[PDB]
Amino acid sequence: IGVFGCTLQVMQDKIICLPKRVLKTDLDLQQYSFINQMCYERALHWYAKYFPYLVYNSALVSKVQFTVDCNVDIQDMTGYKNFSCNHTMAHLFSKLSFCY
Amino acid sequence: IGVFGCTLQVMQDKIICLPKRVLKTDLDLQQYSFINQMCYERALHWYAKYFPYLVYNSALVSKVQFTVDCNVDIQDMTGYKNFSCNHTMAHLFSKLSFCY
Amino acid sequence: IGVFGCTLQVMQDKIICLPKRVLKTDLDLQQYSFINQMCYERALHWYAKYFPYLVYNSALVSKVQFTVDCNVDIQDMTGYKNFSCNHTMAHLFSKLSFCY
Amino acid sequence: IGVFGCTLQVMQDKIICLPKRVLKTDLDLQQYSFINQMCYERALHWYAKYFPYLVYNSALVSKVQFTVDCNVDIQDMTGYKNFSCNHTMAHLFSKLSFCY
Amino acid sequence: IGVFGCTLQVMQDKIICLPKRVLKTDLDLQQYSFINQMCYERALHWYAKYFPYLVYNSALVSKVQFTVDCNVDIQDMTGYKNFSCNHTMAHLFSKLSFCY
Amino acid sequence: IGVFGCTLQVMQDKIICLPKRVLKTDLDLQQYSFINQMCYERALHWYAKYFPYLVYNSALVSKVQFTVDCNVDIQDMTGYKNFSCNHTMAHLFSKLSFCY
Amino acid sequence: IGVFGCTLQVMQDKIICLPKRVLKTDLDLQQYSFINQMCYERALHWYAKYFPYLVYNSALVSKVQFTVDCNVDIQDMTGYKNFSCNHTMAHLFSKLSFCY
């Protein structure tokens, strides 16, 4: 399953982030990708990233949720700090892990 | 069939959503993708996602429809809550399942 | 032929729809794709979709045409209801079927 | 040859159309593609499309030319009727046919 | 070599054209591609196209150059007639032919 | 591992850079890519680049960090000198190296 | 190595150019590609292109540098003559050549 997991990680492991504190946001695609990857690095739990190398989990199953909030310190960098984000494979990996 | 089902799930399984309560919507592509995946996670029935892993269905056949509505709580996030959505694989998978 | 037909279905089976009642239309690509799939589900005849699963046809050959009109109920949703649409494989599939 | 021809018509059989009667034209990419396929269906001679199924030609060789004009009736639909169009496959397939 | 030549022809044989007589030019991508193919058909010498079918050349080697000028009659069509153009295969195929 | 490392280097070795000293920045995609390449060359340590040719590291493991600052002299070229940059594979390669 | 070198030349041998004498530059992507190819043809040393055909080099190793300045005569064509340009394979091929 871990091999299939790394196929998912390479192909479709993407998250999408939009700012919360204040609907156009006047951010370009480069800024959007930068914010997404920053929130992936800081907000998403390390289990999501480390799962495909693997193939204590009792707390891990309930640890990760679908939608997340990250207070990424890009104030004066993108104009916002609080960002709400989501990623489609959250529930997919949750079901996989409940099966796994 | 289930292998074919996960093929369609990987390649062409996207839904499209547009707001209802009030034609430009001044929403960028990132916002559109975020709304699409949010409504896919919330509005779309779990059978649509879980079909390719399997390969009680009597109510499940009539459960889903082509066009759906999601009242996704993204106020001050994208500016709208009610979103009308559709995806091409709705009727396709309905026909496949009636055959299946 | 039916395998070839589903090849054209997956790769190049695309239709394009433009509003009729009143040349920019101030519609984004997401709205265009939504209208395309909506009219594909509604206006396009079920034979066009169901041809590659088979592989009464006397009425089917003259049933469909190249250009179509759909009065899709997207008023206050996209701003127009009447849409004229066309798709390239219409005449191609008509020729195939006349051969087939 | 005909197999090669079907390869080209899948990959590079694209025509481009621009309106004649009156340099921005304020037409979106969807409208451009719609006009392209419309004029391809109406203006381009059936020999160009039907060549890869074959593999009387004396008139066919001089029948088609590189650039074409189509008076496609999309007035109040895209804003123009007369369109000048061209595709790179015209002279290439003419040379192929002269060889063939 | 001719097989390799037709490989570069299918993948990378693209030319770029810009108008001369008078830096934004307010031409869309469709118009740019149309001008590119028009000047490719007109300005570029038939050796560039016909090389990969082959595999008198003494003057033919010095015939073509990297950049070209073409006065394509697209007045009231794109707004300019004189276009300076260049393609990536010019010096590459010149070296290939000097070797060949 | 080093072969896999060069697979990542070819596929997904990308960085994103945003200006620091003062949220739109009115920089095009070409300028964004140029800034990314500059800061990838000057800010990213040579070990990140040279890892896939190898396959003293005690200081090298703690040498690099996820987010970096790059002070590149493109003033009057893109309008800014200080940029903050990040790349996806920083943590992945740090974990790989710690395992390695 | 030369086979690998021509793989890089086909895939990722691209350069980026921005004007120097005077941050938006109001140049479209077609103009950007045209400027890039012009400067690649004139500025980049013939060794960079001719390396994958071979596979006197003592001066060649120090001959080229990563960033270049090229004074391309497209005044009244794109609005600028002086351009600073870069290409990603500079340091990579310099290391390869020092090894080779």
Author numbering:
A (entry chain A), B (entry chain G), C (entry chain F), D (entry chain E), E (entry chain D), F (entry chain B), ...: 38 to 59, 99 to 131, 279 to 323
What does the paper say about this structure?
Volume-regulated anion channels (VRACs) constitute a diverse family of ion channels that are ubiquitously expressed in mammalian cells. They are believed to be essential for maintaining cellular volume, as they are known to open in response to hypotonic stress, enabling efflux of anions and osmolytes, thereby preventing excessive cell swelling and burst. VRACs are hexamers composed of five closely related paralogues of the leucine-rich repeat-containing protein 8 family (termed LRRC8A to E). In contrast, when expressed on its own, the LRRC8C subunit forms a larger, heptameric assembly with weaker mutual subunit interactions and a different preferential arrangement of the LRRDs.
